[PDB]
Amino acid sequence: PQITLWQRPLVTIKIGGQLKEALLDTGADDTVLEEMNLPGRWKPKMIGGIGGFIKVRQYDQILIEICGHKAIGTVLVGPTPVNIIGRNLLTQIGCTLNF
Amino acid sequence: PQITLWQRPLVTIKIGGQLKEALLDTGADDTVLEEMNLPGRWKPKMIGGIGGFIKVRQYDQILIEICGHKAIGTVLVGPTPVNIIGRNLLTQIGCTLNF
Numbered sequence: 182p183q184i185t186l187w188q189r190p191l192v193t194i195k196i197g198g199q200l201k202e203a204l205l206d207t208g209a210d211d212t213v214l215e216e217m218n219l220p221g222r223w224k225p226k227m228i229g230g231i232g233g234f235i236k237v238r239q240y241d242q243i244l245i246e247i248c249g250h251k252a253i254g255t256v257l258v259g260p261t262p263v264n265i266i267g268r269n270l271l272t273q274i275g276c277t278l279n280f
Numbered sequence: 281p282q283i284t285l286w287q288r289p290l291v292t293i294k295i296g297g298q299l300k301e302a303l304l305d306t307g308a309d310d311t312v313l314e315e316m317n318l319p320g321r322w323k324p325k326m327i328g329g330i331g332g333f334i335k336v337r338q339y340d341q342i343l344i345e346i347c348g349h350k351a352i353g354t355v356l357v358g359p360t361p362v363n364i365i366g367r368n369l370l371t372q373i374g375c376t377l378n379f
């Protein structure tokens with residue numbers, strides 16, 4: 182699709198057997214999801230944003246279906262206020278900005 | 281232009297007589313710039329992001345030239361780690377996401 186930006190660019194994702202909504206976020210290097218139940222091992226990481234940092238669990242080689250496209254990569258799970266799809270996965274689905 | 285997302289989507293902006301770089305950020309509702317010298321009145325505001333909140337100065341009807349396109353709107357100025365162009369201004373320059 183083409184998505185204009187008059188509203189937040191939310192999409193449906195499927196990850197870990199679960200359906201969620203997430204924001205297509207060109208300002209995010211990485212993908213950060215709300216606390217959720219994922220299988221597998223993970224590693225602790227801290228990440229920064231506008232208001233300081235948060236501790237996240239880093240999961241690698243996770244499958245995520247984003248508005249009907251499949252992608253595999255790193256997903257960070259922790260206390261983010263919004264589910265964010267970052268450039269690590271936006272590149273895999275072929276997303277571009279245009280103006 | 282069309283911008284792919286293998287690198288951060290940075291652009292040059294001109295605001296308040298000054299040249300800066302900023303990130304085209306579809307995950308940002310509003311535009312948030314580093315502390316900088318802007319003329320005019322402003323109002324205090326707090327905004328939230330991944331790691332808590334920050335206090336910003338809200339300036340309205342500010343002219344900003346973003347990669348060669350002009351836009352007028354609200355700019356929030358405060359301790360953000362990165363200069364962010366949000367959807368309030370991305371819509372004015374006609375920016376879309378595509379995949």
Ligand SMILES: CC(C)CN(C[C@@H](O)[C@H](Cc1cccc(F)c1)NC(=O)O[C@H]1[C@H]2CO[C@H]3OC[C@@H]1[C@H]3C2)S(=O)(=O)c1ccc2nc(NC3CC3)sc2c1
Pocket residue numbers: 206207208209210211212213228229230231261262263265267305306307308309310311312327328329330331362364366
């Ligand atoms: C600050 C930008 C630079 C980065 N952020 C991505 C922005 O798009 C976030 C998304 C957002 C939206 C809503 C709530 C949020 F909690 C967060 N928007 C944002 O703060 O906007 C603020 C501000 C704008 O107006 C309004 O609109 C939303 C909200 C409110 C006030 S990030 O989430 O912090 C991030 C994400 C991934 C990531 N990966 C990293 N990896 C390591 C470096 C390698 S670091 C890193 C940091």
